Amino acid sequence: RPDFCLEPPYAGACRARIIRYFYNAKAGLCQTFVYGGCRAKRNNFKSAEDCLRTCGGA
């Protein structure tokens, strides 16, 4: 699985409240988090499907 999938979620410093998904590598699932709207990292997806497709695999 890609290494960026193992990073913790990054909300950043900006003040928006945007619901995004991240892969939780300990739980083995994609979960939601609130993203602030700037400086997204790669473990940050717009849907569960995109998260699982990218990160769910072995």
UniProtKB/Swiss-Prot annotation:
Bridged cysteine pairs (disulfide): 5-55, 14-38, 30-51
GO molecular function: calcium ion binding; molecular function inhibitor activity; potassium channel inhibitor activity; protease binding; serine-type endopeptidase inhibitor activity; sulfate binding; zymogen binding
Highest rank taxon of the organism: Eukaryota
All copies of domain BPTI/Kunitz inhibitor, residue ranges: 5-55
Localization per Swiss-Prot or TrEMBL: Secreted
A single BP term in Gene Ontology: trypsinogen activation
Record site: Reactive bond for trypsin: 15-16
GO cellular component, one term: serine protease inhibitor complex
Keywords associated with the record: Disulfide bond, Pharmaceutical, Protease inhibitor, Secreted, Serine protease inhibitor, Signal
Function: Inhibits trypsin, kallikrein, chymotrypsin, and plasmin.
Record-given protein name: Pancreatic trypsin inhibitor
Species this protein is from: Bos taurus (Bovine)
Lineage: Eukaryota, Metazoa, Chordata, Craniata, Vertebrata
Residues of the full protein shown: 36 to 93 of 100
